[PDB]
Amino acid sequence: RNLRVLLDTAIPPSFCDTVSSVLLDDFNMVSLIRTSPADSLATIKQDNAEIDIAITIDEELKISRFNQCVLGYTKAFVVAHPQHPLCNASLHSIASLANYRQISLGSGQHSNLLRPVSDKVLFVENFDDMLRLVEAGVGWGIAPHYFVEERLRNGTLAVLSELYEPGGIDTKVYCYYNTALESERSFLRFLESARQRLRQLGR
Ligand SMILES: FC(F)(F)c1cc(NCc2cnc(-c3ccc(C4CC4)cc3)s2)ccn1
């Protein structure tokens, strides 16, 4: 039949392409859906979408009709305008940043992972709007690598996360599979080949 797969906006495009490619190799019919991780898990939970597989970074252990696995990792950066107040410290820390405002994603309840670090916050609905605001000094934010690679190699934006996690904040990328699919050798073959290829990318 059709299998439907969700991937969030934090999943780098090489990642999304690698997954899709393997699925079409080991599945007949593949429909791809994209949402922000908060709406990633909410969306699969709605049950009206008939999402069979979801690849996101948001964590929830007991979900109905869905099991969990780790598919790999992605990296994320705390970014902010170079002339944002914060940049002048040179040694920025989660306490030093809790005073200044965070553009954060939120689309009503919130997960722990995507919980805001600050009392002064502003919710945005996608990453492009987050970064437009950040680039206007409105606040600071947590964005994926693939999104801000260019604005950081261009000096447009800066990084404050090189004390917390040098190199980027290594987040897990989870695969939330529908329970039934566990019994299809196809799902397992997808899983094997994907996990391998993604690690091969990591080099
Ligand atoms: F889409 C992703 F870009 F992948 C993503 C990843 C993500 N990880 C959980 C975290 C939340 N706050 C963190 C943090 C870690 C270090 C700092 C230091 C002070 C600068 C601040 C906040 S890490 C959350 C949202 N979005």
195 token code pair:
């996990």
CA of 5 to the centre of ligand 1 (A): 24
Residue partners of 23: CB distance under 8 A and separation at least 6: 3, 5, 30, 53, 190
Residue 105 dihedral angles phi and psi, to the nearest 5°: -85, 155
28 token code pair:
């007949």
CA of 167 to the centre of ligand 1 (A): 13
Helical pair 145-153 and 127-135, crossing angle rounded to 10 deg: 30
Each domain of the chain, given as residue ranges in start order, spans: 1-203
CA of 192 to the centre of ligand 1 (A): 28
Question: What letter would DSSP give residue 183?
Answer: G
Closest ligand 1 atom to the C-alpha of 10? Answer: 1
Experimental method: X-ray
Stated in angstroms to one decimal place, the resolution of this structure is: 2.7
Q: Which residue is associated with the tokens 């109905």?
A: 64
Residue 81 falls in which region: left (phi positive, over 0), alpha (psi -120 to 50) or beta: beta
Closest ligand 1 atom to the C-alpha of 94? Answer: 19
Nearest CA to ligand 1 atom 10: 113
Closest ligand 1 atom to the C-alpha of 144? Answer: 3
Going by C-alpha positions, the residue among 155, 151, 131, 133 that lies closest to residue 142 is: 131
CA of 10 to the centre of ligand 1 (A): 11
Residue 175 falls in which region: left (phi positive, over 0), alpha (psi -120 to 50) or beta: beta
Nearest CA to ligand 1 atom 23: 169
Q: Residues near ligand 1 with C-beta < 6 Å?
A: 10, 57, 76, 78, 92-94, 97, 113-114, 117, 142-144, 160-161, 164, 169, 171
CA of 6 to the centre of ligand 1 (A): 21
H or E element: which one contains 7?
Answer: strand 3-8
CA of 181 to the centre of ligand 1 (A): 31
Pocket test for ligand 1, best of 142, 159, 173 (most atoms within 8 A of CB): 142
Residue 179 dihedral angles phi and psi, to the nearest 5°: -50, -45
Q: In degrees, to the nearest 5, what angle opens at C-alpha 113 toward C-alphas 46 and 14?
A: 80
For the range 89-97, what are the long-range contacts, defined as Cβ-Cβ under 8 Å and sequence gap of 24 or more? 91/163, 92/160, 92/163, 93/163, 93/164, 94/164, 97/140, 97/160
